[PDB]
Design a protein around this ligand. Structure first.
Ligand SMILES: CCN1C(=O)c2cccc3c(S(=O)(=O)N4CCC[C@H](N)C4)ccc1c23
Length: 127
């Protein structure tokens, strides 16, 4: 078995911006979700070897996780909040693709995604 390289968290040639909305996504949205009792499976890339999910990266070709998102935010990786929101949506969608309704992991994602949508319903003003 073999895990792939994890998603990049630094890229000097990518254009970057420190937006009020991006700061909010790190200080409030990510840090709040991070402390949820159901966040731990999402705090790092899937270790398919450890978890004995040898088919995970046969199915999931755009992996994402909150640890990667947290690093990108702290390293000022994004140009705008929509880029970061899209990473969150990739993380949730990957879980719904690989797993099935009713699985414990899907219940955890469903709960986190509802909280996620509550927190981003209102972002601070692009002053
Ligand atoms: C979110 C990424 N991701 C998956 O797609 C996925 C599929 C099956 C298990 C599993 C685990 S686990 O084995 O540690 N465990 C966590 C909580 C209780 C669940 N029954 C499974 C951690 C993170 C995972 C998975």
């Amino acid at each position: 078995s073999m895990n792939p390289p994890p998603p990049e968290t630094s890229n000097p040639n990518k254009p970057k911006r420190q937006t009020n909305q991006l700061q909010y996504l790190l200080r409030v949205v990510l840090k709040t979700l991070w402390k949820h009792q159901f966040a731990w499976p999402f705090q790092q890339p899937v270790d398919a070897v450890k978890l004995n999910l040898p088919d995970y990266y046969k199915i999931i070709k755009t992996p994402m996780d909150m640890g990667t998102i947290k690093k990108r935010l702290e390293n000022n990786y994004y140009w705008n909040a929509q880029e970061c929101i899209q990473d969150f949506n990739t993380m949730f969608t990957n879980c719904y693709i690989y797993n099935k309704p009713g699985d414990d992991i899907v219940l955890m994602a469903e709960a986190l995604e509802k909280l996620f949508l509550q927190k981003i319903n209102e972002l601070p003003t692009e002053e």
